[PDB]
Symmetry: C3
Subunit: 335 residues, 3 copies
């Protein structure tokens, strides 16, 4: 709980209203009650701010006339919302102190104020930086290193020789460092190629739940600083992802793809390997990426939904489009 004046100061916002108001938490505009701070970005909500029951509303200067409550004026309400939600965050920590049921190899090196949850398993040679938090049921494999401030939720699996930077966050069920999909072929028989590269994860990386990031075959899979990766993603061996790139849920990336900085990969896209995508590329959802991308911009693929009766005709005509093409050429020749 925090006085509105003090909150406004920490957000570098201009206060319009009683600075003595006590703010206890953040809420959506439709759910906000007395004690809550909320925000608005869409001008459509201006007309009904009189129905919002928040104690304060983060808004722009052009919104201030429509205010029906204390208001904090800022240039970017959504970014200010991110910041105030962090000040008023209620999320608990994955663990506190070291649980007696945790199994920690005696050669593990632990920094100051490391927390390890119940039944977590820490292997030999592991290094955990200051303030690292390991959730219940996690596994951290041999000689892996987790930088200061990084946090793993429950039931995360980190394999051996993995490097994670500072202030990272990994959600439950994620697996970092499994074998890449590497095999030779000896007369129809698959021959396993041991995958003895690593994963290097930079600083301030956030990884979602049930995402898999494979280790490299010889050299490393590399995740840049500030990257965010959603749930159910697959990052194959020797993929390199540049700083501040965002990957939405269910994206599948094949081996040895290189993605630049500040990219945005829409959910359920499929990115083929041994190719590069330059900085500042957006791929919209379900994008089928087969070729390198060398110019920044927005790229898309796929034929959208239709009523089933219509789709049947659309698909049949497309599958026979070579015959249409030939008939068009014949007609041009005749005319």
């Amino acid at each position: 709980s925090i006085r509105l004046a003090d909150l406004a100061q920490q957000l570098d916002a201009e206060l319009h209203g009683d600075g003595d108001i006590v703010i206890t938490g953040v809420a959506s505009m439709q759910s906000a009650q007395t004690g809550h701070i909320t925000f608005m970005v869409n001008p459509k909500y201006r007309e009904h701010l009189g129905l919002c029951q928040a104690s304060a509303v983060v808004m722009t200067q052009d919104d201030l006339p429509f205010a029906k409550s204390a208001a904090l004026v800022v240039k970017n309400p959504y970014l200010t919302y991110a910041r105030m939600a962090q000040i008023l965050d209620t999320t608990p920590q994955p663990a506190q102190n070291i649980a007696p049921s945790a199994v920690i190899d005696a050669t593990a090196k632990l920094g100051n104020n490391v927390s390890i949850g119940a039944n977590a398993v820490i292997e030999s040679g592991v290094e955990l930086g200051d303030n690292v938090i390991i959730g219940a049921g996690c596994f951290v494999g041999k000689n892996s290193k987790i930088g200061a401030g990084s946090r793993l939720w429950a039931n995360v699996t980190i394999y051996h020789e993995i490097q994670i930077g500072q202030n990272c966050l990994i959600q439950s069920g994620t697996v970092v460092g499994a074998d890449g999909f590497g095999y030779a072929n000896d007369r129809g028989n698959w021959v396993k190629i041991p995958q003895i590269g690593r994963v290097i994860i930079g600083d301030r990386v956030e990884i979602g739940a049930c995402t898999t990031i494979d280790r490299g075959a010889l050299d490393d899979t590399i995740i840049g600083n500030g990257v965010i990766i959603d749930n159910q993603c697959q990052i194959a061996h020797n993929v390199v992802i540049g700083d501040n790139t965002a990957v939405a849920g269910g994206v599948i990336m094949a081996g040895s793809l290189k993605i630049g900085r500040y990219c945005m990969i829409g959910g359920a896209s499929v990115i083929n390997g041994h190719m590069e995508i330059c900085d500042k590329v957006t791929v919209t959802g379900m994008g089928m990426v087969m070729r390198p991308i060398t110019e920044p911009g927005v790229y898309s693929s796929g034929i959208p939904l239709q009523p089933n009766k219509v789709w049947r005709k659309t698909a049949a005509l497309v599958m026979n489009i070579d015959d249409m093409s030939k008939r068009l050429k014949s007609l041009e020749r005749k005319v």
Copy 2:
């Protein structure tokens, strides 16, 4: 547990034709059935095949009965009766029995009657587990979460904090409920985390497959209606709402703030955009590319299916250049007219 055929027929509301004293030990497919097994016939083309089935009894319709070569249970709906008798004769174990000494249970957790918790499961402060709840081995249930009576988690399920799960739910292994939604503000190209302080509310009789992820809401909640069934490896983003009785097949990806109505059917591997609505009674066939809201009930589809690679090469190239084909068509129309 074995049961007399007459007693089984009674519990199934079926007309017994044959020896009610036969002892049934389990359910089997028609081709696999042996003595002591009960099976079922849904396809009347197998009528001439019943003499090759070695089951002790067969569920069938009244029209099938003249063709029987075994004791028969006559019902209106053999498939539904099979579902029911397989529940009566189910061999599936429970995820746990009693409370394992290796489980780690906070002193403030509130356990109802007849709760079972498997080895090395971890139960946080404030958790409430209703009567007859079963938590499998290695699960994690986070702070203040509530799981209603009769619900069951298989092994290695993760439930985060402040999650509400209804009665008689079933969650398969590897599933994660309540992780942070994909919420970040952009500050000059750097991502700023938005804490996700909403929850997940799961209704009654919900079934969730393995390695599915259901994220908590940003402020308000992600909501799963009653009777919903969700298959393996689906992604349900923050603040998605799924209406009662909707079925979501395997591998479906949903973006944030999608609302799906009641009684929908979402085919496997579909991809659904966020911040929009799908009305009641919508079916999307598999691999559907759902970009826009769906405002009318019925069946919807997308995608260009497989061809021989040599053929696909031409199809893909021609579609990619379809604007040029369109212009050539227009030009030829003008030249002819």
Copy 3:
């Protein structure tokens, strides 16, 4: 782990050119290799670059040998020799060693010789673990399941009940074998669960990646043949049958009751519908949308690739209206036919 180059050459059946007494300590890429490392060359474009490689030895072909600037192992197939030498020099640790005191093992479980069970793993009643089986930390192995000799599970793998796994398999973390198939009946508008009482049978030498799910069958079994390799995030539905030596790349979804033959290659993110068969020696390229049976071997493909968004918008609009284009083409043909 270190080995004399001469001894390594013998084990690889390679012709040594250079000092057999060199001590090799590991494998590395050409770019990263240092003293004590062995590397390999598959692309003759790097011949002019070998003076920059600081490996102690390089695996190459006879045609490469005049370009060597180091000890060389000459072979017919550098890529396969690389696979074999990486196994000889593998640094990958085991998922576990010995039986962890924190493991929870039912009294009726049967263990063979030299079994290792990692910390906090849970082994149910009736489970059978063969000789040299390794179960990683945090695994669950359900009632009456059987894991054959030499098979290994990494950490946090879940095996349900009545599952059978053969010899020398390897399963990566987060994978779930034997969950309920997606089976339900309909009672006047309510879903009714169909208990899934079939099993999963996994053959010998199967490798399964991470966070893959393989559901048990409804009555009869889900079957994975010998030598099959399956990547991460795959979904194998109830009653799927996969034939020997087939490869399934990452993120593939297979619907119920699909049968896939032998020596198939299923590209990443493909979607294969059910109640149908794919014959032997079929390749489906990435993101393939498989709606019909495949009865002839060969390569099959689907999907319209990426374009710039403004171009895509026009492509998509024209395709969605292709029925009107077809009607206009037929009308024009009639006019040109003088009808």
